[PDB]
Amino acid sequence: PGLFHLDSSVVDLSGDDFSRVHRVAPLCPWIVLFYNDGCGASRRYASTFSKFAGGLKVEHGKDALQIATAAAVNCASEVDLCRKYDINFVPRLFFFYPRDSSLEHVAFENSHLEVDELESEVRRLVNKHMVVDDSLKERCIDMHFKLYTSKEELVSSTDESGRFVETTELYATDIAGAFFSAMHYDVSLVGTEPRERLTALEDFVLLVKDSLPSIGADGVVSALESITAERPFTVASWQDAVVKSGIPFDGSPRNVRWRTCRGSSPQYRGFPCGMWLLLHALTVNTPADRNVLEVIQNYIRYFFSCKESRDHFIQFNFSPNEDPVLQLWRAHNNVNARLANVKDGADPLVPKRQFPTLEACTECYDGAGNFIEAHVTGFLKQRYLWDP
Ligand SMILES: Cc1cc2nc3c(=O)[nH]c(=O)nc-3n(C[C@H](O)[C@H](O)[C@H](O)COP(=O)(O)OP(=O)(O)OC[C@H]3O[C@@H](n4cnc5c(N)ncnc54)[C@H](O)[C@@H]3O)c2cc1C
Fold this sequence. Notes:
This protein is of the alpha/beta class. It folds into two domains: 1-161, Glutaredoxin (3-Layer(aba) Sandwich), CATH 3.40.30.10; 162-388, no CATH class. 44% of the residues lie in helices and 7% in strands. The strands form two sheets. A five-stranded mixed beta sheet has the order 1-3-2-4-5. The chain has a two-stranded antiparallel sheet with strand order 6-7. A hairpin with a 6-residue loop joins β4 (92-97) and β5. It binds flavin-adenine dinucleotide (FAD). Flavin-adenine dinucleotide binds next to α9, α11 and α12. Residues 40, 260-261, 269, 272-273, 275-277, 280, 300, 308-309, 313, 329, 332-333, 335-336, 339, 350, 355 line the site of flavin-adenine dinucleotide. The PDB classes it as oxidoreductase.
């Protein structure tokens, strides 16, 4: 799936090797966007980029710019490709060109770039690292097009879908999917070092295994002590370990299925939403004194690849005098507030209401129309109760 699979002007990279994206490809410049379909930032920025690549279809014109081709790597899947470039936070912009004497790459200082600045840059870079021909100029715009029109194929109906209704009940298969997705993808991208990260990871997984029994955390824990000097962490080995933990999610590893987190469209909600559910389920089901909020924050520190989001989250100040449950509830609501009016990159049919709504439970509100925390803390401990 990923973000650009409905857009022809952008080539989706499954691999680093450019010969196999086209014959001519290794001889042409590429502006590559690395992103994560779960990230607020990446979500929003994909607009711009699609728009930018949209301008790269011009047939016979003498713009140095028009010899470049736009491409995108999604780091929620293509973890291997991304690790190769030490990509961690996103989105991220790379200029690739042929090495004249596989490709040489150039890391963009600033990857958040307006459509023109993007153009102004790509242009500048092509001129700098290329010898700008006609023989070359037409050459690229050629394959550049065979890819465009060809990907246009891939994109009753091959479109027509239906009417959408948000599912508001909570289903384990969503919480589990979140856990699977986290271990399988997010842990994989970043690895187990340094030590502080491994620590974070162990503490989190252990806390999951204890709070949410038979979510298949046990299997994952085992995998986590398997790493040693002699058996160091590897994406291949690890992802294998996780699929065989028997985490009870729904769908295929490659494609997880959400229910409560299901959006009006595939590129909305999903993982980030499930991740929240899991975090709340943690606060409710924790054995006493594992710290939860302490642990959780520290997992988000080393495992959450959305940098805008991870940043102010690790700054929340959680005193463990009081109910983890309430506090995280507070925290998650503060976020909804922020994201409330934000139109860019959001699901049109699933708003950001302060949770729970009034229908959700009347018991939580009062005469005035504001929250009675004691009741809310009760409601959450029900809604998120984990029964196997
Ligand atoms: C820790 C964290 C920090 C994030 N920070 C940002 C950010 O800064 N910017 C950004 O764009 N995205 C951020 N995200 C992603 C974002 O929070 C949303 O999850 C996603 O962008 C859209 O969520 P949604 O509309 O599908 O429902 P979300 O609210 O995210 O999904 C949560 C689900 O859990 C329940 N829920 C909602 N609110 C509460 C609450 N108050 N208490 C208990 N349960 C609740 C509901 O069932 C809801 O459907 C963050 C995600 C996480 C996990």
